[PDB]
């Protein structure tokens, strides 16, 4: 099948991007997700850096499915094809003999929501902002590269060096070079409450699915870290978005940031913001305050 | 979409399986897997029985997406409508304001994996023959009712007063009563090593591929709890299957329960047993002995 096919090509193909597994050393667990497991690692003699170089290693949980197995192969497919300071760096796998490692660079701080939800440390609304404005940054770069992410979340951002957003977990996104929309026939692996209203009720993913996404991320941005429609069970998620409800506006948040998650959250995909809008309107407040 | 439709019927549906919240008190988490999460619990005038009743229920983990909320539905619906001593029971659900959570009788030891990993506590190879049996019975029960059951594992088995084996885990199970196989066309989120070559390579599920799971199982009991495949990616086991490798011989095996390992792992679906004979080869072993 399409699996079959893309390993056995994949364990046949680019030395730029082969490392070799005995000069990597592999240490303690950072993260499980639903996907792949990600380590702490030293790399020694990576791409030209003399000595070890610290960085992070994805690879299969125990017992993984067909499912995240492709998920891992396709995700450092994009990995290879994707350079910008707010996008995760990839610098190579080990594919030969052992399982697939994905090696990237290590990003000191972690997921943005473990960052914000250690927080008051004493981040200002200008941080948030600027937060806000890096990511945005990164995905209008990937949708101009014509991907769609589909995954866009505080938990999926990672934060590196000097507060610096790098947007991660690639897994699921899809190439929409011809027509503008990924779709899926089957049920989709996102979590519902990150999910357009159009994702969730007819599988249409977009550029303006992945702002409907940004408008969420805002949200856990803003209330730093928090958990999106509290208390509410993702089934309930369906009739609440069709009849028009969205989150309230949460604390310490502005009138002008708010009616900026609204906008990401319309009904209709063409009235919400493109991410160079969303930029805008970002920086605009930051200068503001 | 699908399960939109799903969750509208279903919200708007039996008495006879719906269980008052308030009812329920739920305890300590038992597990957490790729689509749900058990917990201990407690559960006043259940179905006709006095006093509180001690059960297990699962429910939706933190931040699910469709594919799981289809898969917790589904297992619900399923569970409604088999009866067998060796297939898990359900008692309801609480449906109503709230998460969905399905209510199941409590298997005092969990899974058959923990069970035989945490053994030598002493148990005969007649005790893993009975376990054995006891599942293909439950199999062949499921085979009947025309069900591919799909996820079938050590862990997906429960172990309950006395010994006895529940089949467990049926959010993955398909109705097959028109065509005989069950297709997948995007792939399959059950592990690899257990998958059957043509549930690997052709997204194609029966009977005869539970059978070849069943296979898997009954290595996994016979090396009580081993992990299938050790030391092998699950890549691997696309070349590794289509040129006809199969695990070697465990220790304390006989050649005959080897044999039967053997002809659940045939190429070919039409050569492998069917439930029944799987039920008279274990029988036959048991009494040899
Ligand atoms: C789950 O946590 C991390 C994941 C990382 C990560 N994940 C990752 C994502 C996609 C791919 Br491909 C590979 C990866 F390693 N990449 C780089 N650096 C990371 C760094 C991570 O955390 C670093 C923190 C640093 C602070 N202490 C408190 C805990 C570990
Ligand atoms: C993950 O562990 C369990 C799962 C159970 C379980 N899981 C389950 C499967 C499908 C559905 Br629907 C609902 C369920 F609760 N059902 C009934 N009893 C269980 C009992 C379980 O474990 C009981 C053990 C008992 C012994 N101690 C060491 C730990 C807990």
Same mark, same amino acid.
């Given at each position: 099948?399409?699996?079959?096919? =893309?390993?056995?090509?994949?364990?046949?193909?680019?030395?730029?991007?082969?490392?070799?597994? +005995?000069?990597?050393?592999?240490?303690?667990?950072?993260?499980?997700? /639903?996907?792949?497991?990600?380590?702490?690692?030293?790399?020694?003699?990576?791409?030209? !850096?003399?000595?070890?170089?610290?960085?992070?290693?994805? %690879?299969? +949980? /125990?017992?993984? =499915?067909?499912?995240?197995?492709?998920?891992?192969?396709?995700?450092?497919?994009?990995?290879?094809?994707?350079?910008?300071?707010?996008?995760?760096?990839?610098?190579?796998? $080990?594919?030969?003999?052992?399982?697939?490692?994905?090696?990237?660079?290590?990003?000191?701080?972690?997921?943005?929501?473990?960052?914000?939800?250690?927080?008051?440390?004493?981040?200002?609304?200008?941080?948030?902002?600027?937060?806000?404005?890096?990511?945005?940054?990164? %995905?209008?770069?990937?949708? /101009?590269?014509?991907?769609?992410?589909?995954?866009?979340?505080?938990?999926?951002?990672?934060?590196? @060096?000097?507060? +610096?957003?790098?947007? =991660?977990?690639?897994?699921?996104?899809?190439?929409?070079?011809?027509?503008?929309?990924?779709?899926?026939?089957?049920?989709? !692996?996102?979590?519902?409450?990150?999910?357009?209203?159009?994702?969730?009720?007819?599988?249409?993913?977009?550029?303006?699915?992945?702002?409907? =996404?940004?408008?969420?991320?805002?949200? @856990?941005?803003?209330?730093?870290?928090?958990?999106?429609?509290?208390?509410?069970?993702? @089934?309930?998620?369906?009739?609440?978005?069709?009849?028009?409800?969205?989150?309230?506006?949460?604390?310490? $948040?502005?009138?002008?940031?708010? !009616?900026?998650?609204?906008? $990401?959250?319309?009904?209709?995909?063409?009235?919400?913001?493109?991410?160079?809008?969303?930029?805008?309107?970002? @920086? +605009? %407040?930051?200068?503001? !305050?």
């Amino acid at each position: 099948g399409p699996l079959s096919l =893309s390993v056995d090509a994949f364990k046949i193909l680019d030395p730029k991007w082969e490392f070799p597994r +005995k000069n990597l050393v592999l240490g303690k667990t950072l993260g499980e997700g /639903e996907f792949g497991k990600v380590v702490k690692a030293t790399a020694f003699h990576l791409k030209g !850096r003399a000595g070890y170089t610290t960085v992070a290693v994805k %690879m299969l +949980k /125990e017992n993984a =499915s067909p499912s995240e197995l492709r998920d891992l192969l396709s995700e450092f497919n994009v990995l290879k094809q994707v350079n910008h300071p707010h996008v995760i760096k990839l610098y190579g796998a $080990c594919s030969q003999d052992g399982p697939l490692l994905l090696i990237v660079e290590y990003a000191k701080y972690g997921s943005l929501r473990g960052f914000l939800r250690e927080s008051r440390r004493a981040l200002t609304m200008g941080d948030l902002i600027s937060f806000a404005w890096q990511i945005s940054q990164g %995905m209008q770069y990937l949708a /101009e590269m014509k991907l769609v992410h589909r995954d866009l979340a505080a938990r999926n951002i990672l934060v590196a @060096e000097g507060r +610096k957003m790098k947007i =991660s977990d690639f897994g699921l996104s899809r190439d929409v070079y011809e027509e503008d929309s990924y779709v899926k026939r089957s049920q989709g !692996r996102i979590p519902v409450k990150w999910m357009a209203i159009e994702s969730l009720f007819d599988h249409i993913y977009t550029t303006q699915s992945d702002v409907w =996404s940004f408008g969420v991320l805002l949200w @856990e941005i803003v209330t730093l870290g928090g958990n999106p429609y509290p208390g509410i069970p993702p @089934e309930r998620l369906f009739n609440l978005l069709k009849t028009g409800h969205r989150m309230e506006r949460p604390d310490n $948040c502005s009138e002008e940031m708010y !009616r900026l998650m609204l906008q $990401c959250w319309k009904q209709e995909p063409d009235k919400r913001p493109v991410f160079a809008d969303i930029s805008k309107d970002l @920086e +605009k %407040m930051m200068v503001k !305050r």
